[PDB]
Ligand binder design. Sequence first.
Ligand SMILES: Nc1ncnc2c1ncn2[C@@H]1O[C@H](COP(=O)(O)OP(=O)(O)OP(=O)(O)O)[C@@H](O)[C@H]1O
Ligand SMILES: [Mg+2]
Ligand SMILES: [Mg+2]
Lengths: 99, 684, 235, 59, 317
Amino acid sequence: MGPQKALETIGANLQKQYENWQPRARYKQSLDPTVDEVKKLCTSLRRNAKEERVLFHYNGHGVPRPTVNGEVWVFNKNYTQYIPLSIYDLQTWMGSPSI
Amino acid sequence: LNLQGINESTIPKVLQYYSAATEHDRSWYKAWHAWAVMNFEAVLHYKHQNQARDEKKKVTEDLSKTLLMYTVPAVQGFFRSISLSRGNNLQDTLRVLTLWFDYGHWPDVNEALVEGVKAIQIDTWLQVIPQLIARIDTPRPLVGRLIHQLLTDIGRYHPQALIYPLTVASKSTTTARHNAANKILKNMCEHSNTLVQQAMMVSEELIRVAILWHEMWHEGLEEASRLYFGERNVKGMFEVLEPLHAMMERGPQTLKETSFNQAYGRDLMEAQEWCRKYMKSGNVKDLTQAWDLYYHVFRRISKQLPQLTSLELQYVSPKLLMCRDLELAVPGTYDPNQPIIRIQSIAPSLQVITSKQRPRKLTLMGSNGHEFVFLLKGHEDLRQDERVMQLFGLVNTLLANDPTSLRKNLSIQRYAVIPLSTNSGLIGWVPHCDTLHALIRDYREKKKILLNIEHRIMLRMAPDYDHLTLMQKVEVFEHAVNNTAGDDLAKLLWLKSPSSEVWFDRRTNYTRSLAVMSMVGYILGLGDRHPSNLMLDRLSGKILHIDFGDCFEVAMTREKFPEKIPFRLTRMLTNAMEVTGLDGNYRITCHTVMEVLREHKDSVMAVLEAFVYDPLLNWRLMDTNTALNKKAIQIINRVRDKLTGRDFSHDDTLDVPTQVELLIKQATSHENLCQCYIGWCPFW
Amino acid sequence: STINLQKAWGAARRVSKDDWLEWLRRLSLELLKDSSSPSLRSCWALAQAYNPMARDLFNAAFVSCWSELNEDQQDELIRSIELALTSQDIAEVTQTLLNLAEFMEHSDKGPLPLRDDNGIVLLGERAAKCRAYAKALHYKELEFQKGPTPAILESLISINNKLQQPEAAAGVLEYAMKHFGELEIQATWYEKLHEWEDALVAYDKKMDTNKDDPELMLGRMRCLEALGEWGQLHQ
Amino acid sequence: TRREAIRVLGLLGALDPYKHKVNIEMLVNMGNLPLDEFYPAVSMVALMRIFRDQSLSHH
Amino acid sequence: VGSDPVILATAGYDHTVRFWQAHSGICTRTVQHQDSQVNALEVTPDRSMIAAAGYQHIRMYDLNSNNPNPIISYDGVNKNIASVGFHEDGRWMYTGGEDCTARIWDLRSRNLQCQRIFQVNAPINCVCLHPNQAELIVGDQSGAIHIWDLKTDHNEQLIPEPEVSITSAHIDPDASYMAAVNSTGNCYVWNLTGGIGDEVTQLIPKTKIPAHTRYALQCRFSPDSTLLATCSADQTCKIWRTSNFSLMTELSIKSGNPGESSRGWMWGCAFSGDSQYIVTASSDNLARLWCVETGEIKREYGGHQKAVVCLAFNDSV
Ligand SMILES: Nc1ncnc2c1ncn2[C@@H]1O[C@H](COP(=O)(O)OP(=O)(O)OP(=O)(O)O)[C@@H](O)[C@H]1O
Ligand SMILES: [Mg+2]
Ligand SMILES: [Mg+2]
């Protein structure tokens, strides 16, 4: 499909697939995201789903493998560097009841 | 003839001789050919003397008697001079057509043709199938009946030579062509059927592939927005869009068309409701709602179009995916002597070239086992290119026959051209090539040189470069040339070769190949030779031209940025030759070619006359103005002027060395080059 | 890792064909042992045995080494290459070192700095005796790019002839006409190009000014036999 | 023998080269690459020239 | 600028028009000229306002009032107004353009459209009003000089050399000789018949001076009519004496060093009030007040960033 369209399409399809199982939930895609981008995404979903559960799906096929130091990779704004994101920080922003 | 000329006293004499020549040696090719062509000039002398005197009652009735005395001999002579070549008879065969189409409506000329067409071998006509099918629908009945009957019999032996051009005619917009063309296919069905129906499908599917719906809507809405928002032509704007709405009213025939109709199609149909409300109300508030919907899809399409780097057949045309072991042969491979290299199967992916027009890169597997790559162009008429390649074929024959040329291996690199409609067609992909613009770009990024360096130097010196007077421009232009070493191509030809004994051979080929197309291009009138339109063979070193739209000096006459140049011979091309310069191989090859063309000028004229006077292709000449038969004579007079060395001053007659000297000055002149459009790159 | 190399560079006490060939083999194999890239170092053991292996990796071995060397060592090396080209010409040993010099031009490491001119003049003369006339030509044109002279043009003409390319050689004579005039054009140049008509005209102009010189008499007679003017030639 | 081989080139007659033309990678490797890829590639090509039937019997 | 007896404007590609002083060499005031270059300056005989022919506009700035923009900006012409003449009465203004049409413009009236037109074949490179104020000589790119009469419309076409663009042509104030110049670098002089009243005006060919090797650009006689300055792309402004047509002086702006590819061409030139000096603009950004007899740079005016193609010079009391 060419690079850009494919990424939106995969995001669209992935949403549909999940909607077979849970059709009544706010889905919010992050597509080749930054770190700030993930922070604003997760912190918003915890605000809304106050004490009820939030799903965090991470698909890291295009980025290097997660490190021994408890890190998961995302991008920088320009898509020129793989930025690491701490699992600690990731579980800060996401709340308690989560999957 | 050389002493006297052509006139009232010489024609009866020179015919008296040539008739005798013919008597004394019946079998001899030239004795008949000379007789025929002399008679044929005795026609055009008396036709052009009638238009010179009579136009500028009894004279047209005398002209019937007068020309028919020289027309029937000419035909009978050309028919015998075809049967005595049997191999190299293109000149002779085209002249027969020119006679037939113009004068064949006469009873006596018609008889001569009927008797001739019987005697002659059917293999001869395969040369001129293009020229025949162009006149498939001639309004004159007695002419057109004999064309049909001839094409029919070309169908019964060598149907592979006919299906492609007939199938293009069969889906023609004009009524008479498609009637005539279909009637001939109906005859071909009971010979083949499977072949006809295979070709009928393949061509329909290839056209569908060549321009998708979202590509058509993009070009249509760009054109429709310019008519409405620019010119305020509302009725003409509907002519652009109403076929596109009616186009989709077939429905989704393939998955790509489904997914278009899925995403956008609902809105387009809704926007048509506002347009159809405007036709019976006449409101500004109605029609602005439609352009809101059109610009919604237009922006969404424009965002998509760069992402279509490749098209899969499963989506775009599944009919073609299914195709196995077709009897219908690979386009532009058919030869009546060789065994048919029939289509095994079409490859599933289409590598879309990222250009303005977005051509595909189609590839077919042959029954011989070899892949054949093509370039499937959409919305760019290829009938010119088809004719121009017919000319290069002729010229290659002439260079092969001359020993001087043959010893040097002079020839024009040509490729297959297969039209599929008025818009689209296949071009044969030449391997191991890349455009001169591409080469220089890639060299300059490697060597860290700014790509627009010559341009940047000019605009620094004089930021109003475009608006400067001629002399002002020449100063600025020269300042750029003196302050940039224009050796990029010379340097990269060295770097890109393995040994130096190979390098040397590549460079020899390069120089000669260039010279051949400089001269051939000059005669043809071929303009628009910017560095994207010529490409260099990365093994042989030979040059190759592409894009033959601007022929017969059309780009010299155009209003904004008229070319003042016979051919591209700018300082990068020159530096890539031997360091001594133009005056070695290039200038000498230029002589050798221009000697061959000047000798065989009737052969070159015969071909060029054929595709100037073709009424399907004449539209290119009239369009420069802001009736046609007047303009068409001027073109062909000029071609004779060039081929006779009466092209700089009609008073003088230059020999080849003198003519080639003035041409090289004209191409090399800074005054001429600085006036060129900047995209032409007058400094490479 | 440059003690054994410096013996293989600075020996050059070789007075035969097989002696210089021995200098090559010791030079090539010493480059393999040294080479930093292990893909080349791994072929050393093979190359000791099979020698056409060593010839095939010569240029690649050389470049790997030659980038690592320290300026004074590059000069130490080049002086020995000059000695091999200059002193004692063998068809194998020269055409190895020309193919090294050509390979070095295509690289981004830049050409071998031989003898001040990148050895353009040295390598041209050597390529001419190897009968590698296209290499000879390339170098003789580089010469011409820097500064055209008459003596360059002459050699340029004969190289083109030897290389079967008389129309390119004719172009060299056209260049001479424009940029140098007429005095620089010898009669012999017409003779080389088989311009026997114009060569005779030149030798007539020369024999009027100058006195009875043996060279100019035979030069004019040589034109007459080529023309076939047996009458004038017998006079 | 050398004398006959000339005497037979004589009798068949000085054929013209143009009638005779009808009658009849290592630098390329470097032409493309950077040097760190280049060295394996040229080593392999040279090894696989050997690695075909004849000289391998010992090597 | 206006009140000072001498005027010396200068202009080129940098979008300015700088008014210098001949006695000092100091820039009094600049004036903006956006949208184009300037192809030809011209002070009016009345000296009230300068002219500046450019691309699709003849602009005319005030000489008297200090630091405004243009007064009378004409338009309505396509492709480069190459020249401007001026009628001594101060009513009429002539032009020549790349659109192959000479024109006449009424200054005293409002008509933005030109009054009369004399269309030709090829682009017009130069205009020159004959001192009698009745004939307008017009050169062009095809080679054709013309003499469009301003009362009878009788154009007397003339081609000195076939297929060479005549780039400039001038006729001295006393109507003795007429000079023309072409892109080869020759300087064809023509001797005039004394036909003011009768309008005989017959041009008698005198001498083809082999003036320059490269493109010649402008020629102009002095007010004395003793000297004929001839400028060119070969970086020299030669001065030929009118009697002999032999090289008196040669004003050159070369490097004095073979390692220097194209410093700049010598464009305009303009004699002083008494033919003692000669001003000269060049593409090296510098105007230069030379001395005629000696051949010495008396002054130099160094203001412009980009090149300098025009001059205007006026010592009219
Ligand atoms: N006969 C051919 N063989 C191989 N490649 C070709 C051939 N013709 C064109 N090409 C390549 O395909 C590219 C695009 O084709 P082409 O230039 O004919 O059309 P375009 O650029 O889409 O339209 P236009 O040039 O008219 O703007 C060219 O830049 C060239 O590299
Ligand atoms: Mg193109
Ligand atoms: Mg095109």
